[PDB]
């Protein structure tokens, strides 16, 4: 029953919940061994798992299509943020093995912390689809939502952010030491607003260009 | 839900079936086929050891589907 | 017997429940001694008498310190 439910939450729709491309996992089926009001409880829980499905498809299609090493870094942090949602599905069944007395409310209870992360990162994922940005100005729209105000979605975006700067030190190691360019496609060789994030000082970027250029001679 | 999870495992099982069929048609020249299937065979040698260790833990349980699929996530990605 | 030993596992489960109860209350008692106390109340006993016994015995180890 909840062996079924804790894998329905992992992503499989089933014939208790019906997947949809408007809002997934819709229950309206009545059961006399369940409470009639229980559905309402279930509905709230459904909103979590749907997003967990909608993210994973997003990771599958990428890496006009969207391409880049930034698409290998946003999706990368999207892997690590979803991991305590996996751990907390294991621990729940671990508790259910010993105590079968605990009801659906303990599930709803235990995963209350993911009703803060999922919408506030869902809007960022939607922004990255509706706009077609894939270049270096993706660091800007990730960086402005880093400030947060809800702490657990405040730190999770930090997890992704460092990765991007670690990726931006692969380009700025080939450029700055060996004078090597086009080991990644671009977002003599001029400075443009797309290839430079708009909260890094422009004078430092001029120093960067000079140091990269002088190596080849 | 059962029909979906075993389907996902089946989609991975096609990719192992094609490779094993390719290997069987060598021991049952091009001058690079043998050098390529050698590395493929070595990959299977490592991968099968990992999997048989999980089965060794089955003879000695508390392991469910959701444990081994999350464990084998970085390998089924590498398979694709 | 199989059901007679799962009851013994059940005894150990409540004994760990009383283990958490003993630490949050900061008692000196361990698990073996509390099983002795459980057998004592199987025969029937004042807890007010057992506490006087243990409230003599523990602070008669502080008299040979």
């Amino acid at each position: 029953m909840i062996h079924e439910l804790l894998l329905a939450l992992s992503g499989y729709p089933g014939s208790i919940f019906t997947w949809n491309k408007r809002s997934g996992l819709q229950v309206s089926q009545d059961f006399p061994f369940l409470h009639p009001s229980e559905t309402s409880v279930l509905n709230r829980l459904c909103r979590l798992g749907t997003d967990y499905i909608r993210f994973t498809e997003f990771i599958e299609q990428y890496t006009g299509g969207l391409h880049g090493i930034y698409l290998r870094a946003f999706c990368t942090g999207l892997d690590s943020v979803l991991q305590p949602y996996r751990q907390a599905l294991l621990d729940l069944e671990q508790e259910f093995l010993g105590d079968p007395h605990l009801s659906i409310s303990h599930v709803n209870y235990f995963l209350d912390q993911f009703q803060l992360l999922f919408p506030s990162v869902m809007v960022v994922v939607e922004q990255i689809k509706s706009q077609k940005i894939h270049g270096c100005q993706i660091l800007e729209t990730v960086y402005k939502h880093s400030c947060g105000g809800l702490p657990p979605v405040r730190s999770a975006l930090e997890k992704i952010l460092a990765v991007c700067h670690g990726v931006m030190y692969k380009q700025l190691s080939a450029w700055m030491l060996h004078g090597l360019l086009l080991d990644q496609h671009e977002e003599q060789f001029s400075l443009r607003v797309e290839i430079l994030p708009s909260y890094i000082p422009v004078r430092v970027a001029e120093k960067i260009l000079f140091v990269g250029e002088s190596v080849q001679m | 839900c059962l029909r979906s999870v075993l389907e996902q495992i089946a989609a991975y099982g096609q990719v192992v079936f094609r490779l094993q069929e390719f290997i069987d048609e060598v021991m049952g020249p091009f001058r690079t086929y043998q050098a390529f299937m050698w590395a493929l065979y070595k990959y299977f040698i490592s991968f099968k050891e990992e999997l048989a260790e999980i089965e060794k833990c089955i003879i000695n349980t508390t392991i469910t589907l959701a444990i081994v699929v999350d464990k084998l996530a970085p390998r089924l990605s590498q398979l694709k | 017997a199989a059901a007679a030993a799962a009851n013994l596992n059940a005894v150990r489960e409540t004994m760990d429940v009383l283990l958490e109860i003993s630490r949050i209350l900061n008692t000196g008692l361990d698990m073996e001694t509390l099983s002795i106390c459980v057998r004592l109340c199987e025969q029937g006993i004042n807890p007010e008498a057992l506490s006087s016994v243990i409230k003599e015995l523990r602070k008669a180890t502080e008299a040979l310190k």
């Binding site: 259910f96 093995l97 079968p100 | 349980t61 508390t62 | 013994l8 005894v11 073996e32």
Partner: peptide, 23 residues
């Protein structure tokens, strides 16, 4: 008597068809 018999190896095999306290 209790503590002498308590020290035994418990259930580590878990049932998925007998979820509630598998012997």
């Amino acid at each position: 008597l209790w503590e002498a018999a308590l020290t035994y190896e418990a259930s580590k095999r878990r049932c998925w068809e007998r979820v509630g306290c598998p012997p």
